[PDB]
Ligand binder design. Structure first.
Ligand SMILES: [Cu+2]
Ligand SMILES: [Cu+]
Ligand SMILES: [Cu+]
Ligand SMILES: [Zn+2]
Ligand SMILES: [Zn+2]
Lengths: 155, 155
């Protein structure tokens, strides 16, 4: 079983652009997210499951903000803090950082040990940030992910 | 946990050079390897625990080859197959690939779900290859890691 998520670079002005997919599979140690993306800025990128199954933008203080429609990091256990994928008292949506190579592609799979079944993540969104993820709210909030650069809805 | 492993770039001729550390800690989901490395080549690199507690070279067909003193991938359960970090019938030493950014640094931690206790890795070595890791023995053996670029002995 698997879930192929279509991911798009968010552009509230001229329209979202397809950048590939992220395929979710189950392993004996948790859900595995295998990316097949391209056209992205090289480096480490914050990667988390957000609460709403939406990648639409939302007006925030006069600005149509990319991906705000997805809401915050998925936190069904009410951890109320950003952490490591292997930290029990961190948002359940906190996944390992995504690696984008020099050529703008991302194909390295990552494991989210706290997620066990595919049905558990359906009805939410996967977000890729412009910044990275140090898995802490220190010194920057939410791992320093910053703006939402790409997103897909898990169905 | 906390075992700070000193890592060196391997050069049997010109001499080895310090490139930083890899700190190993225990999490509720397995051992976490947190790198703090510099001076490495950009890209994903094969990252595995090798059997011998040595990073010394060894003669291969008359050629003193970097890191061969470390032996092969640590495979205490006799999987005799290279695979994913979350694959039970793969070498127990198979870790997630290490990400080295454009600037040559690596700070992104990775989880090895099948390694449960610090002591299990003591008495072995941690290897960073020149090539990447597709977590398979095809089309290249041992994930295509190829030559051994950097290494550290786990005390
Ligand atoms: Cu680059
Ligand atoms: Cu996020
Ligand atoms: Cu290796
Ligand atoms: Zn979070
Ligand atoms: Zn292996």
């Amino acid at each position: 079983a698997s879930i192929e998520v279509k991911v798009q670079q968010l552009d509230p002005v001229n329209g979202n652009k397809d950048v590939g997919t992220v395929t979710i599979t189950e392993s004996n140690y948790g859900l595995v997210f295998t990316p097949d993306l391209q056209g992205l800025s090289e480096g480490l990128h914050g990667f988390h499951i957000h609460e709403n199954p939406s990648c639409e933008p939302k007006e925030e203080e006069g600005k149509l903000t990319a991906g705000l429609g997805a809401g915050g990091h998925w936190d069904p256990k009410g951890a109320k803090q950003h952490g490591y994928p292997w930290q029990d008292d961190a948002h359940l949506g906190d996944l390992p950082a995504l690696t984008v190579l020099h050529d703008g592609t991302a194909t390295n799979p990552v494991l989210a040990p706290r997620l066990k079944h595919l049905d558990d993540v359906r009805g939410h969104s996967i977000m890729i940030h412009t910044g990275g993820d140090n898995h802490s709210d220190h010194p920057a909030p939410l791992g320093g992910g910053g703006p939402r650069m790409a997103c897909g809805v898990i169905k």
